[PDB]
Design a protein around this ligand. Structure first.
Ligand code: A1BPK
Ligand code: ZN
Length: 139
């Protein structure tokens, strides 16, 4: 579990979005596993606007943060699950690292700010849904 709070927006994994997220829907993209809802309070997270390929992510299944090198946002095949049929998920970045299903929503950060959130994993890999291209989150 986990979310990003920036301005009047809340960014969560689309498969974990609540009834309130869907009732206050701003934008969602099944292919990115992302959903943005509107909030009443002002969020304080800063979004990175860069092309960093190193950062640190939060791993709930270990209660630890880990440094990682990660790939650039790309189309990657994601195995079948209880939330989606087998498909290509876009704007996804992979890293070698520990991850378990309940790890979705853990934030990835670089020196510039929030890069993305955990969205896929397994076999000693971890995948992050990128948010750096969503320039509207800041206006
Ligand atoms: N984006 C998707 O299609 C996901 C939808 C929810 C289900 N999902 C996974 O649980 C994949 C997975 C396996 C093993 C470790 C981990 C994960 C996610 C977090 C770390 C994939
Ligand atoms: Zn950066």
């Amino acid at each position: 579990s986990g979310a990003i709070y920036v301005g009047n927006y809340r960014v969560v994994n689309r498969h974990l979005a609540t009834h309130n997220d869907w009732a206050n829907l701003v934008w969602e993209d099944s292919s990115r596993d992302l959903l943005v809802s509107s909030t009443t309070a002002q969020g304080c997270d800063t979004i990175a606007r860069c092309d960093c390929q190193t950062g640190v992510y939060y791993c709930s299944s270990r209660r630890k943060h880990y440094p990682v090198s990660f790939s650039k946002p790309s189309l990657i095949f994601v195995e079948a699950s209880e939330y989606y049929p087998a498909r290509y998920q876009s704007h996804l970045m992979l890293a070698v690292g520990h991850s378990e299903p309940g790890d979705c929503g853990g934030i990835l950060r670089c020196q510039h700010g929030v890069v993305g959130i955990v969205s896929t994993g397994g076999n000693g890999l971890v995948g992050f849904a990128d948010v750096r291209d969503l320039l509207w989150l800041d206006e």
